[PDB]
Enzyme design. Structure first.
Site, PDB file in Angstrom:
ATOM      1  N   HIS C 101       0.841  -1.213   0.000  1.00  0.00           N
ATOM      2  CA  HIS C 101       0.000   0.000   0.000  1.00  0.00           C
ATOM      3  C   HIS C 101       0.860   1.239   0.000  1.00  0.00           C
ATOM      4  O   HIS C 101       0.518   2.270   0.612  1.00  0.00           O
ATOM      5  CB  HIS C 101      -0.888  -0.002   1.241  1.00  0.00           C
ATOM      6  CG  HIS C 101      -1.893  -1.160   1.246  1.00  0.00           C
ATOM      7  ND1 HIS C 101      -3.212  -0.990   0.908  1.00  0.00           N
ATOM      8  CD2 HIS C 101      -1.741  -2.452   1.581  1.00  0.00           C
ATOM      9  CE1 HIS C 101      -3.846  -2.165   1.055  1.00  0.00           C
ATOM     10  NE2 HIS C 101      -2.948  -3.073   1.441  1.00  0.00           N
ATOM     11  N   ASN C 174     -10.018  -2.911   3.218  1.00  0.00           N
ATOM     12  CA  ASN C 174      -9.803  -2.867   1.743  1.00  0.00           C
ATOM     13  C   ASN C 174     -11.131  -2.670   1.073  1.00  0.00           C
ATOM     14  O   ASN C 174     -12.164  -2.528   1.767  1.00  0.00           O
ATOM     15  CB  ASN C 174      -9.191  -4.185   1.203  1.00  0.00           C
ATOM     16  CG  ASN C 174      -7.691  -4.328   1.494  1.00  0.00           C
ATOM     17  OD1 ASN C 174      -6.970  -3.351   1.821  1.00  0.00           O
ATOM     18  ND2 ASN C 174      -7.191  -5.543   1.251  1.00  0.00           N
TER      19      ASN C 174
HETATM   20  C1  HEM Z   1      -6.973  -8.661   5.516  1.00  0.00           C
HETATM   21  C2  HEM Z   1      -6.399  -8.260   4.394  1.00  0.00           C
HETATM   22  C3  HEM Z   1      -5.657  -7.059   4.650  1.00  0.00           C
HETATM   23  C4  HEM Z   1      -6.181  -5.725   4.568  1.00  0.00           C
HETATM   24  C5  HEM Z   1      -7.523  -5.177   4.201  1.00  0.00           C
HETATM   25  C6  HEM Z   1      -4.989  -4.993   4.937  1.00  0.00           C
HETATM   26  C7  HEM Z   1      -5.093  -3.573   4.906  1.00  0.00           C
HETATM   27  C8  HEM Z   1      -3.924  -2.736   4.823  1.00  0.00           C
HETATM   28  C9  HEM Z   1      -4.073  -1.306   4.492  1.00  0.00           C
HETATM   29  C10 HEM Z   1      -5.328  -0.556   4.115  1.00  0.00           C
HETATM   30  C11 HEM Z   1      -2.750  -0.739   4.596  1.00  0.00           C
HETATM   31  C12 HEM Z   1      -2.468   0.711   4.301  1.00  0.00           C
HETATM   32  C13 HEM Z   1      -2.637   1.557   5.565  1.00  0.00           C
HETATM   33  C14 HEM Z   1      -2.216   2.958   5.168  1.00  0.00           C
HETATM   34  O1  HEM Z   1      -3.016   3.666   4.519  1.00  0.00           O
HETATM   35  O2  HEM Z   1      -1.082   3.369   5.491  1.00  0.00           O
HETATM   36  C15 HEM Z   1      -1.860  -1.868   5.020  1.00  0.00           C
HETATM   37  C16 HEM Z   1      -0.432  -1.695   5.252  1.00  0.00           C
HETATM   38  C17 HEM Z   1       0.353  -2.807   5.790  1.00  0.00           C
HETATM   39  N1  HEM Z   1      -0.114  -4.060   6.000  1.00  0.00           N
HETATM   40 FE1  HEM Z   1      -2.051  -4.870   5.992  1.00  0.00          FE
HETATM   41  N2  HEM Z   1      -3.844  -5.633   5.200  1.00  0.00           N
HETATM   42  C18 HEM Z   1      -4.273  -6.926   5.118  1.00  0.00           C
HETATM   43  C19 HEM Z   1      -3.372  -8.071   5.227  1.00  0.00           C
HETATM   44  C20 HEM Z   1      -2.071  -7.870   5.835  1.00  0.00           C
HETATM   45  C21 HEM Z   1      -1.420  -9.007   6.529  1.00  0.00           C
HETATM   46  C22 HEM Z   1      -1.939 -10.405   6.823  1.00  0.00           C
HETATM   47  C23 HEM Z   1      -0.201  -8.410   7.008  1.00  0.00           C
HETATM   48  C24 HEM Z   1       0.813  -9.087   7.824  1.00  0.00           C
HETATM   49  C25 HEM Z   1       0.952 -10.398   7.672  1.00  0.00           C
HETATM   50  C26 HEM Z   1      -0.129  -7.007   6.540  1.00  0.00           C
HETATM   51  C27 HEM Z   1       1.012  -6.140   6.849  1.00  0.00           C
HETATM   52  C28 HEM Z   1       1.005  -4.713   6.462  1.00  0.00           C
HETATM   53  C29 HEM Z   1       2.222  -3.915   6.478  1.00  0.00           C
HETATM   54  C30 HEM Z   1       3.610  -4.291   6.895  1.00  0.00           C
HETATM   55  C31 HEM Z   1       1.777  -2.624   6.023  1.00  0.00           C
HETATM   56  C32 HEM Z   1       2.573  -1.352   5.855  1.00  0.00           C
HETATM   57  C33 HEM Z   1       2.163  -0.486   7.069  1.00  0.00           C
HETATM   58  C34 HEM Z   1       3.030   0.740   7.368  1.00  0.00           C
HETATM   59  O3  HEM Z   1       4.105   0.767   6.853  1.00  0.00           O
HETATM   60  O4  HEM Z   1       2.653   1.673   8.138  1.00  0.00           O
HETATM   61  N3  HEM Z   1      -1.258  -6.625   5.693  1.00  0.00           N
HETATM   62  N4  HEM Z   1      -2.554  -3.165   5.097  1.00  0.00           N
END
Ligand code: HEM
Ligand code: HDD
Ligand code: HEM
Lengths: 726, 726, 308, 83
Positions: C101, C174
């Site tokens: 993202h 999402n």
């Molecule tokens: C359920 C499905 C998922 C959704 C809807 C989801 C949603 C998101 C969203 C919307 C962001 C962006 C937030 C922003 O605007 O800065 C994000 C960032 C992130 N997500 Fe999740 N995610 C999901 C699955 C995962 C899973 C399972 C992991 C870990 C195993 C994960 C690890 C991260 C990481 C490392 C970032 C970067 C955050 C940052 O740097 O501040 N994503 N995800």
């Protein structure tokens, strides 16, 4: 050429005793000491002799003494890329120190088991006595910075990295068998309370301040490891002369899948030995690097630190057989109830080449286990498992800290992880994910098995609701401190009282001191009254009537908890000061040095100036240090040979030398006219146990002195020392 | 085992045309292509096949599909060290992108000089025609992030790291011979003005916005490089078909100590070639990785990018003999006045294994020079020398970025610098300072000399007061832009006008468009009028009377400034789209494919769907892509063979394919009934230059189409395209 | 003075339709639009008009056009601290982008509940229809870098930070109501499979490559969110015209301690609308910032994104 | 840059000037100040070129280096007067 003609700038590549030669990088001092890890480090070791001085980009430098300037008294020019690279590197040399255990000293060695342990563990490193596993061990204090002093009163860390053929196993232990707290959630609180206080960042390397005792007085779970820290366990003589413990109950898992609970021990083959408090504290000022130096020089001498690994083994069906919880890390398992099985020996036989590259950047983590071991629900261990991976992200700069040479496994490692700061490995796999077809799913998962199998957790049954709650079985705080207290010798007990009394005297808020004495009264009345007396506190009628806690499974004491109760002293590697005069009886010196050489005991020849003196028969004797330069703090015993005693008899420093050794309970030996010195330490004409004296230094004088040295210190002397002004 | 049994998952390890095989890591595609740098990287290359999946500590993993939980529907446990290592490493994969030139594509190769240049430079890599120097080159755009598109309008970077026996030399240049600004102090202002605007971070990869043209309108020194970016120079067809320039005047120093001023050039052996704007802009959506892809696949096909290094040499006595200051990086030195002398050839012949490890972490810096080269006082160069060491401290995590494998010298490097984050080298020198006696002062400084000597700066005289002042000799802004303009063909001039017109139409504040048009009126009234007419702006009588700037040392034009004025066409490595139907004349397709193969021109067989089609004689023809899947933007020419044309005649995508290729001035060849497509592009019966048509693909049909391909585009079609709706 | 005399450099601080005025920072475009979070940021907002240009240490700069040199054609001197502070700052501007993202566009706003939900949750921000909670929302794509294009085919992120009186609540969702995988242990595998392939770092912003479909073909649990991504849900017209979903079942806990399972939804009050592929893919060329631009300009116009 | 984490170390409270500071520097790790200037470059017209350079003067003027005379060759050499 700047080296001296005679080549005396370079130490001999052979073992030499402490101070005989300048110390050196391990690969230069001992080039033929090898193990599989030290050999694998060859790709990154860099030499120097005969090479040109260059930038980091390989450009040869003509003038490494001046900046580029417009005119020889003009301004420095920005185009000077040699000066900028060199200053930029320097400006970024430091990395964050470890949050705790920042002060530590490390060495390479190897481990080998005594027998196959395959009946109890499938861990490959324990599978055959001819299996040699390289290790790297770092010993540490807990509280102080990387630049704080070694001989403070503290718990010590004892971390060992085993480079096994089935992965790195880190056994990350301390020198006492329990910890201060029960649940990892409290670790930042406890560590904040012991560390320098936040307003002014005092005191360094000491628990002797208000916030530490405030926490202890409010959290009685701490009292057991507090007892250990206040005893002489808190001030070891050497990292070679202390015990290590994993503290937590872990599990061994065998090829059949049977789990046995295990607590890990290291037994020092040099025996247990500690300093006394006045000696330790003074030694933080005279040599703050004393333990680091001692370990390095022991290894340079061939006096290798050796430890026997031991296991306390409890069957799974005996989980609830004790009157304490096996998962409570504030509880020890007394050896009287569960003996230590001796399982292997670890020998530290080579110093690093570069302290920052190998010691400061080493990363140890208790979560680093291998097939054949497993965790338990000990709630302090559970929280540790999170911290040691997380903290390396900032300390070592990112997630590829396993590629820093000292941390690399010597066995194969392949997986789908990629990138991150300072990525060294260049992956050629077409795939960086699994399952994949494009690389036929390689590298591939491996089912668990008896040898070379993948890691599977022991399928422990978990039944309970999601709670933030301490087990009621952990709610007992006084019975182990009491077991510890009752197991000490009466001199050990006096040193405990004195440790509490000295520390609580530095607590400014008196109610804290009172609250701590109240806690002591729940442990043992004698201990509480002795401390209270030294603090000007009187126990109330209620405190005098607190029912002592119960015995531990019918144990009254366990001598294995004492440093001294059971004789196990080794004199090899110890050091004697010899106080010279300008006309020494060479007959004395010959006999002394011979007797010491036979028992592997080192000597330091001391005088009132550097250079050399001449013995009665014309022998020239090189002086190692002055009286003030190498204080009695740094040696185990003092011998004063015969000769021209008038030369030193009124030397303030020579007299003080013996008064300080005397006060610190060290053996002292006086030959012929050296007996004049009995007056300075107030010894009666017909002698005193602990003072060896004779007409001259024959073989009978040396056997007596070496016998006193095997007992470490002269404990019977304690009631005499209060009188001596030193 | 998930790979197909036929083995079709794995690309053949032999050169293969674009799209024939999946692409792969360099060392797997071309294992036998070697050079000294590629070989030295073997110590860090990691394979995968036949190895067990492990953690980074070497512990085999059994189940890489699941977290450890309490019950198979229960909560995940903190003790899952395998999950946490894997997610921690993922969580920290990213490092900061480069502040500028964040988007770039890189390859390995080698350089060799044509003859020894010992008479003019003691640089070791230029000393012997038999001396081969490995290189790593990264080409880039300037404004967009690492995820931005390749075929934007921008300047491009062309950075070469020469791994020499006397150190790394980095020649860090662009694809135009001047820069936008004169003094490094302005670099953050200029870059902030071109980068996305700070409130909303728009636009990506584009200078077509207010703040860029605001800065240009206020800083006329920018106009020369702006003219070049608005020309088709700003939209190259490939990294292989652009020039490279080091921009600054540097010095060459020979063994007698004589300095010669030098500007560096790279001439593309493939010739100079650019896209047209509409095609470039649309291609940033249909394939934002078009240049990266094209570079990778050329190398996989054996169409190695080749460039010739050339020097413009100016004697020290001629520093002041030109109308412009040699130290001013906004001024070019016309090849009519100072010819480029050919010096050697560079061939890029192997792709990296891992883009992050080799491309993303490579660090180039123009301060990295070697003995034999030196700097000048160019005030833009002088500030660059500060920036490229500073920026790696954050980008690459510390001062040890030279130990990242790709950045390592292949020659010896030894010095007294120690520690820093991620320190790999384990120094065994007893000394970490000089002068020292304890290591006999090694490593040692080396005097300067003719071969293998230390670096010494040329002793240029400096005289002046300490000032922040632009030299008056730099205060001329319009003559070089005018020389550029006058040197272009008329179709090139039209494209420059359309560039300025398109870009300024995106500027929301109309007064800025007006102020730029005013600047253009100082360069050339024809240019200013034609841009003004496109923006609906009328020049004032004052503007119409601005007197043109003077010629440059008497030159009214210099044809080496044009992409196309002197034909230098090379078809090898170009690609043709072949639009199939369901019953192609196999005789046509035999003739077409073999003629293209003979000239090293690739083909892509396109259709309305994937899979296969069968020719008139039963030959089975595999389809590479659909008409929409591989748009005409991605090829150099279009051939439509005879067959069942009614099959595609009504296909919107097939017709639009030709209309797009036509609008973008590409050669189109129609055989037999394919000539029915002439009505789609409105070609007359008697045909027209740039359309090849015959009854069949035999006789001179392919020779004609190849002659068109050699001239790159059909410029004469420009008047005919304004009316086509495509 | 460099401004035009007519004041046309400066946008009107009133709502205006897209393109009518240059766009501007929020606090300058809409100075009277406030909420407790926006106000709280006033301690760190820095103006510019009427102030002297200085170093970061507060020293006024006389000449910001030239380096310090020994003579006007001479070498640059190391003592030029003004040059070096400015270039050092510039050299360290960039920070790592988000692992996923990385490409995203955000705005400030506020939320309020229609009625108290105290019967099913004790969450303070849902307890009172007249208690407003400031929010900050970021919308994003998943696969591409921070400089990739907006109208790619991808899933979109819809993350909301609620600044409540009892703490920050982040609803990180999402635009489809499921995810591709079941267990977080697989997330690096899936993400590596969708992201640019590791040898050449191609393709950007696209699942249309071998490693992604290799993973899909081997992990049928992915098929549900893959169907979503391949539909027109994969190419929304605007962040204003897509749905949001928290995906996971969470719990609501009321004052009596009762737990109810909950899945969270955002309903776009502008209605659901997507592009068609050929249009979306060409728009990544003609305007790679199209959703970022459209959101910013809807807010400047008063066409505020609303969601239920 | 390494010790204090990046180029915004003058924003750490104890380091902050108490007098005004305004310029066109942007971003960096841990950026606290939120700039509202429409321009992040100069010269600019879009913010009427603020914040603006200030000529040197007796008080409250811009910093100008003393115009010391420099004369000699580019050398890496210790002045003999230092020996
Ligand atoms: C359920 C499905 C998922 C959704 C809807 C989801 C949603 C998101 C969203 C919307 C962001 C962006 C937030 C922003 O605007 O800065 C994000 C960032 C992130 N997500 Fe999740 N995610 C999901 C699955 C995962 C899973 C399972 C992991 C870990 C195993 C994960 C690890 C991260 C990481 C490392 C970032 C970067 C955050 C940052 O740097 O501040 N994503 N995800
Ligand atoms: C005072 C600052 C400054 C100035 C005036 C310039 N640059 Fe630069 N350039 C940088 C500061 C910088 C930098 C910040 O240090 C970069 C970004 C990250 C890096 O490693 O270097 C960079 C990157 C960079 C790259 C990318 C190198 C790579 O692929 O990693 C190229 C090709 C150039 N520059 C070329 C030029 C040319 C031809 C210049 C003018 C003649 C120029 N730069 C002026
Ligand atoms: C059983 C009580 C504990 C013992 C015996 C123990 C032992 C150690 C030892 C010996 C080291 C130093 C390793 C080296 O030489 O480099 C260490 C470091 C560390 N410990 Fe533990 N520890 C204990 C509890 C904890 C807990 C509960 C936490 C987290 C809550 C923790 C977090 C750390 C951290 C953050 C470091 C620094 C490690 C590094 O930076 O590489 N300690 N501890």
């Amino acid at each position: 050429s700047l080296a001296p003609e005679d080549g005396s700038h370079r130490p001999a590549a052979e073992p030499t005793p402490p101070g005989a030669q300048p110390t050196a990088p391990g690969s230069l001092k001992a080039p033929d000491t090898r193990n599989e890890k030290l050999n694998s480090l060859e790709d990154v070791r860099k030499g120097s002799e005969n090479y040109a001085l260059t930038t980091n980009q390989g450009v040869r430098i003509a003038d490494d003494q001046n900046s580029l300037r417009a005119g020889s008294r003009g301004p420095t020019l920005l185009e000077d890329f040699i000066l900028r690279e060199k200053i930029t590197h320097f400006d970024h040399e430091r990395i964050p120190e470890r949050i705790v255990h920042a002060r530590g000293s490390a060495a390479h060695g190897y481990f080998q088991p005594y027998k196959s342990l395959s009946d109890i563990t499938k861990a490959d490193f324990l599978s055959d006595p001819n299996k040699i596993t390289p290790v790297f061990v770092r010993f540490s204090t807990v509280q102080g910075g990387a630049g704080s002093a070694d001989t403070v009163r503290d718990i010590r860390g004892f971390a060992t990295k085993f480079y096994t053929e089935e992965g790195i196993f880190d056994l990350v232990g301390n020198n006492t068998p329990i910890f201060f707290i029960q649940d990892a959630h409290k670790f930042p609180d406890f560590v904040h309370a012991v560390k320098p206080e936040p307003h002014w960042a005092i005191p360094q390397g000491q628990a002797a301040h208000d916030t530490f005792w405030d926490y202890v007085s409010l959290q009685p779970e701490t009292l057991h490891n507090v007892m250990w820290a206040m005893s002489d366990r808190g001030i070891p003589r050497s990292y070679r002369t202390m015990e290590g413990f994993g503290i937590h109950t872990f599990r061994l898992i065998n090829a059949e899948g049977k789990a046995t609970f295990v607590r890990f021990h290291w037994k020092p083959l040099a025996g247990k030995a500690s300093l006394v408090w006045d000696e330790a504290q003074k030694l933080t000022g005279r040599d703050p690097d004393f333990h680091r130096r001692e370990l390095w020089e022991a290894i340079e001498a061939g006096d290798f630190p050796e430890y026997e690994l031991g296991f306390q083994l409890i069957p799974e069906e005996d989980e609830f057989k004790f009157d304490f919880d096996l998962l409570d890390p504030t509880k020890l398992i007394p050896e009287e109830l569960v003996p230590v099985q001796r399982v292997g020996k670890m020998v530290l036989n080579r110093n690093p080449d570069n302290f920052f590259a190998e010691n400061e950047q080493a990363a140890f983590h208790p979560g680093h286990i291998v097939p054949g071991l497993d965790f338990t629900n000990d709630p302090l261990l559970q929280g540790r498992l999170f911290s040691y991976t997380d903290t390396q992200i900032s300390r070592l700069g990112g997630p590829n800290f396993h590629e820093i040479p000292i941390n690399r496994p010597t066995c194969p490692y392949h997986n789908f992880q990629r990138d991150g700061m300072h990525r060294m490995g260049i992956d050629t796999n077409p795939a960086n994910y699994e399952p994949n077809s494009i690389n036929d799913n390689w590298p591939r998962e491996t089912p668990p098995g008896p040898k070379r199998g993948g890691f599977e957790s022991y399928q422990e049954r978990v039944e309970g609701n999601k709670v933030r709650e301490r087990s009621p079985s952990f709610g007992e705080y006084y019975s182990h401190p009491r077991l510890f207290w009752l197991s000490q010798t009466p001199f050990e007990q006096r040193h405990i009282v004195d440790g509490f009394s000295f520390e609580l005297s530095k607590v400014v808020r008196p109610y804290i001191r009172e609250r701590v004495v109240d806690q002591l009264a729940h442990i043992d009345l004698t201990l509480a009254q002795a401390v209270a007396k030294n603090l000007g506190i009187e126990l109330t009628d209620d405190q005098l009537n607190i029912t002592p806690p119960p015995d531990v499974n019918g144990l009254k004491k366990d001598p294995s908890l004492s440093l001294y109760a059971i004789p196990d002293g080794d004199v090899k590697g110890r050091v004697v000061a010899i106080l010279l005069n300008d006309e020494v009886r060479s007959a004395d010196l010959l006999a002394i040095l011979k007797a010491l050489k036979a028992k592997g005991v080192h000597a330091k020849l001391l005088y009132s100036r550097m250079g050399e003196v001449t013995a009665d028969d014309g022998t020239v004797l090189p002086i190692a240090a002055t009286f003030a330069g190498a204080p009695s703090l740094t040696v185990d015993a003092v011998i004063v040979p015969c000769g021209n005693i008038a030369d030193i008899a009124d030397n303030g420093d020579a007299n003080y030398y013996l008064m300080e050794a005397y006060k610190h309970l060290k053996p002292i030996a006086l030959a012929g006219d050296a007996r004049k010195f009995k007056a300075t330490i107030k010894i009666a004409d017909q002698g005193e146990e602990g003072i060896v004296e004779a007409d001259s230094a024959d073989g009978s004088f040396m056997d007596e002195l070496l016998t006193l040295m095997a007992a470490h210190r002269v404990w019977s002397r304690i009631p005499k020392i209060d009188k001596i002004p030193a």
